[PDB]
Design a protein around this ligand. Structure first.
Ligand SMILES: OC[C@H]1O[C@H](O[C@H]2[C@H](O)[C@@H](O)[C@@H](O)O[C@@H]2CO)[C@H](O)[C@@H](O)[C@@H]1O
Length: 373
């Protein structure tokens, strides 16, 4: 018979996943099939769509933790069995990220915090203050997936904005802070990056920004370890640096993302599934994933290895970590991602930042109301 694994991580890491699975299979006898879903237009939530109709995989690898709230609530995830996760081997925020309604539903594999990747050919020294940033941006260019909340939240949070109010670990989905005076100021700066700085056009997105950077046309770009391989293949002499402080003198607040692995509740071979998951998420595995893409391991013991401690990716990570905000993992967070398109209207000047902020929050509250039966 066969065990099917769906991976949302591609590139070098995918190859490591396949070799580890092959080795596990030689001992267990089950045939293991790995499918690359990273390019699926349906996105991360495609797992629920498939799992709802009994067409899902047995194991899922490389899923950003925010998505699991939906899967867990709909009963598409098998709870993590006892003895598999030792909460003491990870930072506390990493563990909270995999818990849904108090139950651990997935295993952490890596931790992510977006940073600024720069071309040392154009930008010898990375900017640290907004003043230096404007200087380097006007001179050699800057672009990123500007209307994607995952990335621009760094600015929003920097101005005091927030998605759901955090009350000592408990999120209040009724207290949204995306239309506070601070957020509006953030949206204005986002608008300015196009209308006055002219660093980007209302049309610029992640695809264009990445292509431009790989062609050596722009000096800075906001990204993550998922682009490490493509950058090295383009032989760009790059560096990694945290977001600069914003014009209000505050530090930007990027999201902290935890990449996870989990088991489908419908899978008939759950004992074997978890054994496989343990192999794909072990300390040895995490060392392999770090090798090429520089993916930061979730396990604290591997983070302490000298190879990791000395990498540019880890240095930026450690300097931004205390300012990073873990993405909410509750079901309502999906309503946020889906109402996100409004940001493009604000950036394009179709609506003012004031009104756009209001429309954004209203579309989120509506989407949330839609959820729940
Ligand atoms: O853009 C919405 C999207 O944001 C996050 O996805 C990240 C992902 O976590 C990163 O690993 C990388 O792939 O960049 C993505 C953003 O382009 C959320 O995790 C995801 O659920 C959401 O759809």
């Amino acid at each position: 018979q066969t065990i099917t694994v769906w991976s949302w991580q591609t590139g070098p890491e995918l190859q490591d996943v396949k070799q580890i699975a092959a080795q596990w299979a030689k001992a267990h006898g089950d045939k293991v099939i790995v499918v690359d879903q990273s390019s699926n237009p349906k996105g991360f939530q495609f797992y629920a769509t498939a799992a709802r109709t009994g067409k899902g995989p047995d194991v899922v690898f490389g899923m950003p933790h925010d998505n699991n709230g939906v899967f867990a609530e709909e009963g598409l995830m098998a709870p993590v069995p006892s003895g598999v996760l030792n909460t003491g081997l990870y930072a506390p925020n990493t563990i909270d990220a995999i818990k849904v309604n108090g139950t651990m539903y997935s295993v952490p594999v890596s931790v992510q915090v977006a940073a600024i990747y720069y071309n040392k050919k154009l930008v010898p020294q990375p900017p640290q203050t907004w003043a230096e940033f404007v200087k380097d941006a006007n001179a050699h260019g800057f672009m990123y997936d500007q209307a994607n909340l995952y990335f621009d939240y760094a600015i929003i949070g920097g101005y005091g904005g927030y998605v759901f109010k955090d009350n000592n670990g408990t999120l209040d989905p009724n207290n949204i802070g995306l239309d506070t005076p601070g957020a509006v100021q953030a949206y204005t700066l986002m608008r300015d990056m196009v209308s006055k700085y002219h660093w980007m056009t209302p049309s610029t997105n992640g695809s264009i920004a990445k292509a431009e950077f790989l062609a050596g046309k722009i000096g800075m770009y906001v990204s993550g370890p998922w682009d490490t391989a493509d950058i090295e293949k383009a032989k760009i002499d790059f560096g990694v640096t945290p977001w600069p402080t914003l014009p209000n003198g505050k530090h930007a607040t990027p999201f902290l993302g935890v990449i996870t692995a989990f088991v489908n509740k419908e899978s008939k071979t759950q004992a074997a599934d978890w054994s496989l998951v343990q192999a794909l998420t072990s300390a040895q595995a995490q060392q392999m994933y770090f090798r090429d893409s520089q993916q930061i391991p979730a396990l604290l013991s591997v983070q302490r290895s000298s190879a990791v401690q000395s990498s540019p990716t880890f240095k930026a990570f450690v300097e931004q970590l205390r300012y990073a905000v873990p993405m909410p993992n509750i079901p309502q967070m999906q309503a946020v991602w889906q109402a996100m398109s409004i940001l493009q209207n604000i950036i394009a000047g179709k609506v003012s930042p004031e009104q756009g902020a209001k429309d954004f929050v209203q579309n989120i509250q509506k989407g949330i109301m839609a959820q729940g039966s």
